[PDB]
């Protein structure tokens, strides 16, 4: 499948390529409904 592992610094554009959406609130789930 894959040869050698490469490691490098994390560019901000590369981090935005990893992601799937900005987190903006510190709340996690609700506990009244367990849906997040």
């Amino acid at each position: 499948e894959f040869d050698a592992i490469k490691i490098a610094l994390a560019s901000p554009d590369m981090i935005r390529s990893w992601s799937f959406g900005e987190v903006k609130k510190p709340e996690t789930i609700n506990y009244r409904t367990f849906k997040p």
């Binding site: 996690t28 609700n30 506990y31 009244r32």
Partner: peptide
């Protein structure tokens, strides 16, 4: 209507000496 679970989080290391590390 929030009962945010981060106010229910168990302090699961409640017996550790405060000077120990890595946890």
């Amino acid at each position: 209507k929030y009962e945010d679970v981060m106010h229910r989080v168990v302090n699961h290391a409640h017996q550790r000496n405060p000077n120990k590390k890595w946890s």
